[PDB]
């Protein structure tokens, strides 16, 4: 068996993907990924930051699903502080979580399509991505690394007229998905590239710690938004699509349907959005308004403390997970009572998924390896941290 070394140093496949394949002709016998090419020491760096300063690091783990990791870190901190989040912030956080899910699925589906030779859908999808990135920028001033979801709520309230603009997007997005499906779903070349490729049984998915679409493709009804709900997810209607074959073609269909259900959640969040405060009112971790900091001695003192020392977290440890676009994203946070986390372990779904490439790609063709990587939806920021 000869060994084919494949590292695409370009975002055709992830930029830092490196694969050592043992082949029998054009058939793969063993796929060994070499990682750490994007290992940046995030978990070590977080220990030297206050809880507020560590928040931007979570935007840069799964850099296609920014606000989702913001949400997981805030929930873990809120869990350790026993902090009550107001209802309006909960709806905003869920709304932008679902916007993030569409942003992620649009990139994952069309970069995968582009890798198997379908070049048009990427251009059609990235235009829709631009409309959604505009909503990121209008609430936070940043296209991608918003740092908008924070412990106790969100950084700022929605600008006037944003909800109407979001509603306008929802009125046409179903047609955009319909166009994406017509280019791919019924086409015989697309089916021939995806059907019966990378079959994962339910037992295999559980054994290898698979989650998200990687687990639901195998017929397992498991979604953390329903299994362990958080924020206002228990007050929203959405269906959980599951596969019947466990192949790359099933997981493609599931991501399309998840985008349709994400549209459903956004519409409900837009109509159910209540008025009220968007920060928690416990004056221990919430920054005061600019007007009170400049008028009240107590507010100025609180502002001085929050931006120099930050808030303390009582000594404890817990694991918090959310349903990120790529699967279960978890944070194991250890606090020692101080203003900096003692240990922050990040559980990345792509770490487990890419580890499953060896058994998933066994006895397939060389050209199927990229398809299987695309169906796993790998981003090496979270794999390597």
């Amino acid at each position: 068996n000869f060994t084919l070394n494949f590292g695409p140093q370009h975002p055709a496949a992830h930029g830092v993907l490196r694969l050592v394949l043992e082949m029998n002709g054009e058939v793969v016998e063993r796929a060994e990924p070499h990682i750490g090419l994007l290992h940046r020491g995030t978990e070590k760096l977080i220990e030297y930051k206050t809880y507020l300063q560590a928040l931007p690091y979570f935007d840069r783990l799964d850099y296609v699903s920014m606000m989702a990791q913001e949400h997981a870190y805030s929930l873990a901190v809120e869990k350790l502080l026993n902090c009550e989040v107001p209802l309006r912030a909960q709806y905003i956080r869920v709304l932008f979580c679902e916007i993030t899910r569409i942003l992620n699925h649009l990139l994952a589906l069309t970069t995968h399509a582009m890798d198997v030779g379908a070049l048009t859908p990427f251009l059609w999808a990235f235009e829709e991505r631009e409309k959604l990135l505009e909503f990121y920028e209008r609430v936070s001033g940043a296209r991608m690394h918003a740092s908008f979801i924070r412990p106790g709520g969100v950084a700022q309230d929605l600008p006037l007229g944003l909800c109407r603009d979001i509603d306008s997007f929802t009125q046409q997005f179903a047609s955009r998905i319909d166009e994406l499906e017509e280019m791919l779903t019924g086409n015989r070349i697309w089916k021939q590239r995806l059907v019966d490729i990378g079959t994962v049984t339910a037992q295999q998915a559980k054994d290898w710690g698979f989650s998200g679409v990687m687990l639901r493709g195998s017929g397992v009804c498991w979604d953390l938004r329903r299994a362990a709900p958080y924020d206002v997810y228990d007050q929203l209607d959405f269906d959980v699509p599951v596969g019947t074959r466990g192949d790359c073609y099933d997981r493609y269909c599931i991501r399309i349907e998840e985008m349709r259900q994400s549209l459903r959640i956004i519409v409900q969040c837009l109509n159910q959005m209540p008025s009220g405060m968007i920060k928690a009112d416990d004056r221990k971790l919430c920054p005061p308004s600019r007007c009170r900091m400049k008028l009240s001695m107590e507010s100025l003192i609180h502002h001085f403390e929050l931006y120099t020392e930050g808030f303390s977290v009582p000594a404890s440890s817990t694991y918090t997970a959310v349903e990120a676009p790529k699967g279960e994203f978890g944070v194991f946070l250890v606090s020692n009572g101080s203003n900096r986390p003692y240990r922050c372990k990040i559980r990345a779904p792509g770490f487990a998924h890419l580890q499953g490439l060896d058994f998933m790609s066994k006895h397939h063709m060389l050209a199927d390896v990229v398809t299987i990587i695309g169906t796993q939806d790998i981003v090496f920021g979270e794999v390597d941290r």
Binding site: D157, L158, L160, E181, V267, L270, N271
Partner: protein, 54 residues
């Protein structure tokens, strides 16, 4: 202040999320008959053109 961004009175208009069907396309037999008839008549025309060329 007291004005926050949110839904209008009554909420926004309903939006569709389900896939929309589309019945565009001819029939197995229609396109078969077209091809068969074109073949027969066209090969007769080929014979006629070959006679004139000769």
């Amino acid at each position: 202040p007291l004005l926050q961004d949110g839904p209008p009175p009554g909420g926004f208009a309903p939006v569709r999320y389900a896939r929309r069907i589309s019945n565009t396309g001819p029939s197995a037999m229609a396109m078969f008959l077209a091809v068969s008839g074109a073949f027969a008549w066209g090969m007769y025309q080929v014979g006629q053109g070959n006679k004139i060329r000769r």
